[PDB]
Paper text:
Strigolactones (SLs) and karrikins (KARs) are two classes of structurally related molecules that mediate signaling pathways to stimulate seed germination. SL and KAR have been reported to be recognized by the homologous proteins D14 (DWARF14)14–17 and HTL (HYPOSENSITIVE TO LIGHT; also known as KAI2, KARRIKIN INSENSITIVE2), respectively. To elucidate the structural basis of ligand specificity, we determined the crystal structures of ShHTL1, ShHTL4, ShHTL7, and ShD14 and compared their structures with those reported for ShHTL331 and ShHTL529. All the structures were highly similar to one another, consisting of a canonical α/β hydrolase domain and a helical cap.
Therefore, our results suggested that ShHTL4, ShHTL7, and ShD14 were able to hydrolyze rac-GR24 and 5DS, but lacked KAR1 binding ability. Y150 was changed to F150 in a subgroup (ShHTL4, ShHTL5, and ShHTL7) of the divergent clade, thus losing the hydrogen bond between helices αD1 and αD3. Therefore, helices αD1 and αD2 of ShHTL4, ShHTL5, and ShHTL7 slid away from αD3, resulting in larger pockets with a reduced chance of causing steric hindrance with ligands. This finding is interesting because ShHTL4, ShHTL5, and ShHTL7 have been shown to be highly sensitive to various natural SLs (polyspecific receptors) in a previous study. ShHTL3 of the intermediate clade evolved from the ancestral HTL paralogs and developed the smallest binding pocket due to the presence of P136 and F190, which are proposed as the major structural bases for the ligand specificity of ShHTL331. It is suggested that the divergent clade ShHTLs lost the ability to bind to KAR due to bulky residue 219, and they developed a highly sensitive subgroup (ShHTL4, ShHTL5, and ShHTL7) for SL binding likely via the evolution of F150 and other pocket-composing residues (e.g., residue 194). ShMAX2 was also able to interact with ShHTL4 of the divergent clade in the presence of rac-GR24. ShHTL4–ShMAX2, ShHTL7–ShMAX2, and ShD14–ShMAX2 interactions were induced in a rac-GR24-dependent manner.
Author numbering: 0 to 269
Write the structure that this text describes.
């Protein structure tokens, strides 16, 4: 059979070309979240897709609770994936968590990345005296408390609120399907990690060009966070807001988001 890293992350390679586009997904989804975007890319790029460890499509026994208590475990998985599949200078396009993992990875291994397109990314969701992440700490702890109380109940509100729109919409139904296929203890572990994550000290060390993409109204990512990322990244960057509501605009608003991503994949920051 194929490599252990490839089978553990369900790595899939489509198309062909000189440049490889790598697609990463966020919490509660898997690589199937990119099914609408991939046809726009396979004729000119090689496209690699992979699942984060912990996704409902991955083996629950491979989720080392110690290893994935910080982003480093996901960052080292990504490096191993691109190594095992011999990718260099890829165009990385990732939603939320995965784009941050790629950005940090580029600090130590800049050979693997030509640029990073971050969608709805944030270095820290909790406010401090000098930083606005969107949530006071005594809101996040109350959140973390409620997720340990009734996790499935919190996720049943989480999914439509975070995606935005009608309970009946296709995006909310699809996001719920993959979110509820996760194992509760694994998902809770991931939310704990995101909840305490603070990537602010890393931003100055990231020097690969970053394209900061997010919805103008994201319940988890204030527009101030995109501006904070732009300001504190160590290399070139650009910010473009998608005029829409939702944390997963690639899933909920493809008609706006897919044209934005293709233009940022193709064109470079001068
Ligand atoms: Mg993030």
């Amino acid at each position: 059979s194929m490599s252990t890293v490839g089978s553990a992350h369900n790595v899939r390679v489509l198309g062909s070309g000189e440049t490889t586009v790598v697609l990463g997904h966020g919490f509660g989804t898997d690589q199937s979240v990119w099914k609408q975007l991939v046809p726009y890319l396979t004729d000119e790029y090689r496209v690699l897709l992979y699942d984060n460890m912990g996704a409902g499509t991955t083996n629950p026994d491979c989720y080392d609770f110690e290893r994935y208590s910080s982003l480093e475990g996901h960052s080292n998985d990504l490096i191993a994936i691109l190594d095992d599949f011999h990718v260099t200078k890829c165009i990385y396009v990732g939603h939320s968590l995965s784009s941050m993992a790629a950005a940090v990875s580029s600090i130590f291994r800049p050979d693997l990345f030509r640029k990073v397109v971050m969608i709805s990314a944030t270095p820290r969701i909790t406010n401090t005296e000098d930083y606005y992440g969107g949530f006071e700490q005594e809101e996040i702890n109350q959140m973390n408390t409620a997720m340990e109380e009734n996790f499935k109940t919190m996720m049943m509100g989480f999914a439509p609120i975070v995606v935005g729109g009608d309970l009946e919409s296709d995006a909310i139904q699809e996001f719920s399907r993959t979110l509820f296929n996760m194992r509760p203890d694994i998902a809770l572990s991931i939310c704990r990690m995101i909840s305490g994550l603070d990537l602010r000290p890393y931003l100055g060390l990231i020097v690969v060009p970053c394209h900061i993409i997010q919805s103008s109204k994201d319940m988890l990512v204030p527009v101030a966070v995109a501006e904070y990322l732009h300001k504190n990244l160590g290399g070139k960057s650009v910010v473009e807001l998608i005029p829409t509501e939702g944390h997963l605009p690639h899933l909920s608003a493809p008609e706006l988001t897919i044209p934005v991503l293709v233009r940022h994949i193709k064109h470079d920051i001068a």
